[PDB]
Write a protein that binds this ligand. Structure first.
Ligand code: ATP
Ligand code: ATP
Ligand code: ADP
Ligand code: MG
Ligand code: MG
Ligand code: MG
Lengths: 509, 471, 55, 187, 254, 120
């Protein structure tokens, strides 16, 4: 044992006299810098988790308060800090700009501007490190949140104020479930109603810069960057900027929660924050654990993913929904970080690369996916048809082995091989085409009721596209009688019988 | 000279120096005196009482404690410019080919920062190389980033020296080959494979390539900085001149893996399976300087060793995000004689899109991959039921799928010393047309041995007539 | 231990992924079929080619 | 921070941290040849069955070992920068290693004019006519304006010679040369 | 501790190296100047394969031309002396010992003597190669030059890596296996083949020290056990024994 | 809280813990923030004593008793994992709720072939 601040220059002045020349209550010199971790002699009044501000213009964050020095992580390059550089205080935990002057802008994890339009014009701030609401200021979730995907809205539904984990292997369609979740909201976000709007945030952690640049151009052309904030700690940065970047984006989306509005945040992905924390711990010499993660790494993703809440009428009526993204490695959902975040959240959506090549895109596994809330977070019409649909696509999975070499089976088993392969063909869907909700209640009503059994399975994905363009134009008055009433009455249940059968005749030509 | 330090502790390839007057910053260069060769040490940490912790770039034999150390005032300064073409260069920018010195008027320090968000060209294109698995199933892009995966002995130095033949001779812009730790034998072929092929000219000034070679007989601190001497010559051609460049690097796993060889000697606690705790940070510091900005373009092809065929290893699985196009070579395919070994169901590009490549290219390559995943569900039935139990529809699947699998193989021009065949170079319009017909049924009447190692589909019927005449 | 996402499962076409004595019993069984169709087809080529000229 | 004067020994450990912070602090104001006279007077009052009874006692108090030595170090003879040093060691917890520092400061201050003596190791002692040469021909080597010192230790296992060590030199002439006749038995 | 030669003073592999095995010379040929890895288990044939090669060059060494000879070297690491004093017997009835050297560091030696042995044996090989002639060198084996580096550099208080091996076991084998050159003809034209032996546990080739040395050598010879016992002896897996053919210098009639 | 209705009142207390794995997982986080070297698969060295000093305070004394009912999560379908191995050493029963018995219409969803009791 020697102690860190027992070097030959610290002791040397104390033999001379009292330390009046430097005060050490407010400014402290640096002992030793290396790999983005500094050691500072002095700074007696520094609070834990307080920003400091180095001599070369960079910033910091105080994490280790030790009896002779303080260890502070550095934002930015380390070729600007040296040994003997005065450090000062700001006097607060880190804060970020917040308002509605962020909408349509692209910000990094400290609230600055990168898209080159101009400086942000907000007049408010917020600390990144605040707490969740308690047991009392919430209420059970009841609001639909629509994605536009026939699988996600009918088999594993999301509500407002819920966590839902997008988990799956590489190259599977993860970033694209959460990019027409955004584009689908333009239906509601230009109209006149206020309790159906939504304001989306996208957080990019550790991606390369020119995948973000291919995303501000995907969303501008589809006209959804007038209500979308983009927070981007990319890969070339320092490691603590990628550590703050989901807290920096979960405080930007809490102002929309405290004020009776709604929001939705997409962490992409949470398996690169947890590696950015681990680099910072094991250079601060905090003791490791399993897979060299520190002990408090369940404490990273538990205090973050519990700030998504559904508040109540006496607090404003806000919301916040979170979709975190996690990448496994060859179907191994039993590693360390993929087993923390499955325990925290409220369900997962599981995408496989075997189904991606067998012709099923979006490549969703239905058997290994769940939402814990489920049928309460659906509209009263999507609840009506999917209760017959989720059951019948579940009976197909038990007899799914017989289909390879089978014709000498029972007529009941030859039926489940028939009906189950039509419903699989309905759920296919092209990229960047979200659907309105009452239109999906048209398509799914055709398959599950019996109006597709007399057709050929390569003619299912043609019939759906020809059934929709006939019902948008020549029946627009009946796709607003579900979007208003909500529930399919019998006066509409008898009218769609006279549309599908009076179209199934004049189709096959 | 400034801060003439002194050496105190040479433990491995990690030398610590102690400065009397002036401490240098992180990432500098230091010059050890009194040696007949040039040994360069780069600063990495500041320890207290004016001692730094460096890393040598050469051999640490003969280092007596108390030895003076000068300082230059900057990171390592290489030569750069137009006169670096048709040359081979060291990590610290020196000649290693015994032709004399590099006479340039511009130096570039190898530590720069990634260009910002507002300097990002967004456009996609297509690029045709001539191969029926690249151009059909995982197509390239003019300015994209391309990674060649796969284990040891599957075909990565051949597939990367065939694309040097195909693209980097019919190209107007320039190319750079950076050799980051590979066999010094293989770094003598490509120096001589391209003197006779006109890409290097040893008497006049019309060469179109530059070489950077630090191989696997080098200490593991110098096998971490030839990845950065590469994309400093390959950035002066993009930024300063407004040109177009090609970037060839083999192998880029030796940049990561030579950072795990000095992690614990520096003083860090090692992470998971043995790598340094700064894996995805020192990597992404480098793989963001290889981008196409709005001043030029870079088309980068990098070979990526997968250790022990384990793709879920942390050194390859953190490289799958810095790339637009992945071509993954397997070994269970190259054991069947199929060459190029490229896996059809594991390669993937971004521009496989019905709005860039067209809605005829897209419907083909999503039926080749759909009939090959239909094959594997039948191979588990054949292992029990045998081949002559299947129905007559499923027999038609296996025959076309084996016709498609044999047609994906193609004789490269650099296999004219290995197999004795003759080389092909198939255009794109014939590639789409040939595969469109095997799925239709218009070659159901041929033997499979016609399709093995041909070019266009019209050569695969000129073989089924020679087999029937010599019967 | 298969009725759970945590419990491990198998892929499609994994029998020939191992390399056992069923992956060999199937790699050779396919060559003992598609070598003998390669001379039913081969013999018929002279006639088929002639037939094309005829019509 | 500031730069400091280089001590000509540069030892390491918990001694040479504090024993260089004292050499650098006292070489300022030219307090060097004085302070060794004061460090040899605390080098006698440390060995006392009331002073050493609580200079190494853990269980007295963290605080009362600071006022008890500060009252002790000032009143009797001296108030230089050593009075801060004894207050510096006691404030940190390094009172146990206090005799180590002064044995470390002594070897650091000795080389400012000293020699790090040689060690003649031969036999039963010798006369004056053969020793005053070796106390003068050992001065012909160094030649830097110095006044030499020496140690003697008698060993009979060396049968017929003397070994000497001027610093780290070791010119050996002894009965090791029986083992060097292995080359007769070594083909 | 000398340095491997670079890119200018080499040339490609022109010549053959005949082993006299018939599964080697016909199917998996080995040029002169090519690092070939004999890998397999214990008691399968790894030493015998590299001793028929020592014997078989007897016919060229009593011949007349100075460019068909092949002077040989055997390095015994971690072997008991009742195997190395018995292999000098097998190499002296056939008069094989008049053209070889045996550098020997037995299992009784100090752990810094089993580490220094292949770097000393390889440096007697480069008397030949740097003066004109052609050498050959067998490391038997190189899984015992690694556990002499793991022990010697744990007691120097160096922090362990994987399986307590140091950081630079890849740098340990790579700075060795790159001196096996083939010089150009304006230096002398000499060659230096190398045949490293590697023992693996339970026939698993995906271990730490195997895969680090598979990817330094041009080709391999995979010796198995079920070939040895069914009857194929020398038990060479001719399916897997790949080889970068060495500019295909097999010979014209073969 | 559960002992005042055993000691100071003399009644038959119940006690629900949800769940017994997050008690165990949180002990391994405290023990690794202090610095103690971990056990088998990654848990803390004091894994059976820490469960001991909690599970031994639930007995039937002469005044009253405490009963307990604890939910268990079995990680990676591994019934010999160090955390459910140590918890099974203290159990006197099991109850299994399965997905299939709910489909038959039977409430509560109890599997009568895989639910045990040691005092049987
Ligand atoms: N529903 C779909 N239909 C057709 N193609 C799709 C669909 N979804 C995704 N793709 C294709 O998948 C490719 C890659 O998908 P994407 O990159 O969005 O998935 P990812 O799993 O997030 O990959 P990564 O994790 O590497 O970012 C894209 O090129 C896109 O064309
Ligand atoms: N060509 C051969 N044909 C048949 N048997 C052989 C042949 N060569 C060697 N053997 C036998 O195989 C056995 C093992 O051979 P060898 O000693 O070379 O194996 P090894 O793996 O080198 O042994 P170790 O594991 O001790 O190094 C010996 O008993 C030897 O007699
Ligand atoms: N056209 C070809 N396709 C596949 N493999 C080939 C071809 N021609 C030769 N080979 C063999 O495949 C091996 C591939 O090794 P190589 O690509 O050189 O190194 P790497 O280990 O980096 O893949 C070569 O040794 C060569 O013998
Ligand atoms: Mg993505
Ligand atoms: Mg290679
Ligand atoms: Mg042997």
């Amino acid at each position: 044992k020697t102690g860190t601040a027992e070097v030959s220059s610290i002791l040397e002045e104390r033999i001379l006299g009292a330390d009046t020349s430097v005060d050490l209550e407010e400014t402290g010199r640096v002992l030793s810098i290396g790999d983005g971790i500094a050691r500072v002699h002095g700074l007696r009044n520094v609070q834990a988790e307080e920003m400091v501000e180095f001599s070369s213009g960079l910033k910091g964050m105080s994490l280790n308060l030790e009896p002779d020095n303080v260890g502070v992580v550095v934002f930015g390059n380390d070729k600007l800090i040296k040994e003997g550089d005065i450090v000062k205080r700001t006097g607060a935990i880190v804060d970020v700009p917040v308002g509605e002057e962020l909408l349509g802008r692209v910000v990094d994890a400290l609230g600055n501007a990168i898209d080159g339009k101009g400086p942000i014009g907000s007049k408010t701030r917020r600390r990144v490190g605040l707490k969740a609401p308690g047991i009392i200021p919430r209420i059970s979730v009841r609001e639909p949140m629509q994605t536009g995907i026939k699988a996600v809205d009918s088999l594993v539904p999301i509500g407002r104020g819920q966590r839902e984990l997008i988990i799956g292997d590489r190259q599977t369609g993860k970033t694209s479930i959460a990019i027409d979740t955004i584009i689908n909201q333009k239906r509601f976000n230009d109209g006149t109603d206020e309790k159906k709007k939504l304001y989306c945030i996208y957080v990019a952690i550790g991606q390369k810069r020119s995948t973000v640049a291919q995303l501000v151009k995907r969303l501008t052309d589809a006209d959804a960057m007038k209500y979308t904030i983009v927070v981007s700690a990319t890969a070339s940065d320092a490691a603590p900027l990628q550590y703050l970047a989901p807290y920096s984006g979960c405080s930007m989306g809490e102002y929309f929660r405290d004020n009776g509005k709604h929001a939705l945040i997409i962490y992409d992905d949470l398996s690169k924050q947890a590696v950015a924390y681990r680099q910072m711990s094991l250079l601060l010499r905090r003791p490791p654990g399993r897979e060299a993660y520190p002990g408090d790494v369940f404490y990273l993703h538990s205090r973050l993913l519990e700030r998504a809440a559904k508040m109540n009428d006496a607090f404003g009526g806000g919301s916040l929904t979170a979709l975190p993204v996690i990448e496994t490695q060859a179907g191994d959902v039993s590693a360390y970080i993929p087993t923390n975040v499955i325990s925290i959240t409220d369900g997962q959506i599981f995408l496989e690369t075997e189904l991606f090549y067998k012709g099923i895109r979006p490549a969703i596994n239905v058997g290994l996916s769940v939402s814990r809330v489920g049928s309460a977070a659906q509209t009263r019409a999507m609840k009506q048809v999917a209760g017959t649909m989720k059951l019948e696509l579940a009976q197909y999975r038990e007899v799914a082995a017989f289909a390879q070499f089978g014709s000498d089976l029972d007529a009941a088993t030859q039926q489940l091989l028939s009906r189950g392969v039509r419903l699989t063909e309905l759920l296919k869907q092209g990229q960047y085409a979200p659907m309105a909700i009452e239109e999906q209640v048209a398509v799914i009503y055709a398959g599950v009721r019996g109006y597709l059994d007399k057709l050929e399975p390569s003619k299912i994905t043609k019939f759906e596209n020809a059934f929709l363009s006939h019902v948008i134009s020549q029946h627009q008055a009946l796709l607003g009688k579900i979007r208003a009433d909500g529930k399919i009455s019998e006066e509409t249940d008898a009218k769609l019988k006279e549309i599908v059968t009076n179209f199934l005749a004049g189709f096959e030509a | 000279g400034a801060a003439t330090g002194r050496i105190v502790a040479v433990i491995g390839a990690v030398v610590d120096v102690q400065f009397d007057e002036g401490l240098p910053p992180i990432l500098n260069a230091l010059e050890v005196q009194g040696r007949e060769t040039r040994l360069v040490l780069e600063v990495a940490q500041h320890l207290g009482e004016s001692t730094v912790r460096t890393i040598a770039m050469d051999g640490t034999e003969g280092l007596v404690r108390g030895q003076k150390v000068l300082d230059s005032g900057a990171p390592i300064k290489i030569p750069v410019g137009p006169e670096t073409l048709g040359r081979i260069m060291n990590v610290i920018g020196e000649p290693i080919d015994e032709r004399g010195p590099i006479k340039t008027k511009q130096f570039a320090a190898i530590h720069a920062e990634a260009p910002e968000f507002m300097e990002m060209s967004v456009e996609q294109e297509i690029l045709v190389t001539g191969i029926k698995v690249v151009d059909l199933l995982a197509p390239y892009a003019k300015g994209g980033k391309i990674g060649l995966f796969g284990g040891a002995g599957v075909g990565k130095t051949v597939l990367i020296m065939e694309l040097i033949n195909n693209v980097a001779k019919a190209h107007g812009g320039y190319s750079v080959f950076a050799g980051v730790g590979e066999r010094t034998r293989e770094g003598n072929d490509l120096y001589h494979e391209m003197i006779e092929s006109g890409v290097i000219n040893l008497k006049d000034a019309t060469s179109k390539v530059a070489l950077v070679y630090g191989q696997m007989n080098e200490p593991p601190g110098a096998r971490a900085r030839v990845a950065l001497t590469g994309l400093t010559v390959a950035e002066y051609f993009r930024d300063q001149e407004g040109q177009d460049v090609l970037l060839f690097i083999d192998n880029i796993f030796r940049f990561t893996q030579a950072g795990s060889e000095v992690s614990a000697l520096l003083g860090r606690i090692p992470s998971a399976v043995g790598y340094q705790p700064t894996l995805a940070t020192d990597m992404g510091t480098m793989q963001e300087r290889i981008t196409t900005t709005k001043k030029g373009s870079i088309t980068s092809v990098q070979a990526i060793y997968v250790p022990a065929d384990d793709l879920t290893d942390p050194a390859p699985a953190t490289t799958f995000a810095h790339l637009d196009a992945t071509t993954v070579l397997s070994r269970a395919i190259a054991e069947l004689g199929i060459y190029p070994a490229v896996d059809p169901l594991d390669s993937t590009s971004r521009i496989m899109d019905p709005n860039i490549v067209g809605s005829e290219h897209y419907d083909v390559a999503r039926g080749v991959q759909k009939i090959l995943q239909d094959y594997k569900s039948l191979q588990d039935i054949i292992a029990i039921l045998g081949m002559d139990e299947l129905s007559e529809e499923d027999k038609l699947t296996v025959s076309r799928a084996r016709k498609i699998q044999r047609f994906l193989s193609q004789p490269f021009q650099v296999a004219e010393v290995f197999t004795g065949h003759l080389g092909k170079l198939v255009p794109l319009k014939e590639t789409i047309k040939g595969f469109q017909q095997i799925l239709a049924g218009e070659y159901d009447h041929l033997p499979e041995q016609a399709f093995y190692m041909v070019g266009p589909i019209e050569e695969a019927v000129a073989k089924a007539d020679k087999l029937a005449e010599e019967h | 231990s298969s009725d759970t996402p945590e419990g491990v499962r198998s892929g499609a076409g994994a029998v020939r992924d191992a390399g056992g004595a069923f992956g060999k019993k199937e790699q050779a069984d396919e060559e003992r079929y598609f070598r003998a169709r390669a001379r039913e087809q081969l013999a018929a080529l002279k006639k088929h080619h002639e037939n094309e000229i005829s019509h | 921070f500031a730069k400091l004067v280089r001590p000509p020994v540069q030892i390491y450990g918990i001694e040479g941290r504090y024993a260089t912070a004292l050499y650098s602090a006292a070489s300022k104001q030219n307090k060097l040849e004085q302070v060794e006279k004061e460090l040899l007077r605390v080098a006698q009052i440390l060995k006392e069955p009331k002073v050493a009874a609580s200079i190494m006692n853990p269980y007295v108090k963290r605080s009362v070992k600071v006022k008890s030595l500060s009252d002790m170090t000032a009143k009797e003879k001296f108030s230089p920068l050593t009075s801060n040093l004894i207050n510096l060691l006691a404030e940190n917890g390094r009172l146990s290693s206090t005799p180590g520092v002064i044995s470390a400061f002594s070897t650091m201050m000795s080389v400012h004019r000293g020699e790090v003596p040689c060690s003649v190791t031969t036999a039963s002692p010798l006369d004056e006519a053969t020793l005053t040469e070796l106390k003068t021909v050992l001065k012909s080597f160094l030649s830097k304006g110095q006044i030499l010192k020496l140690e003697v230790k008698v060993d009979p296992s060396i049968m017929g010679g003397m070994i000497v060590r001027i610093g780290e030199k070791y010119v050996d002439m002894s009965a090791k040369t029986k083992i060097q006749k292995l080359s007769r038995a070594m083909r």
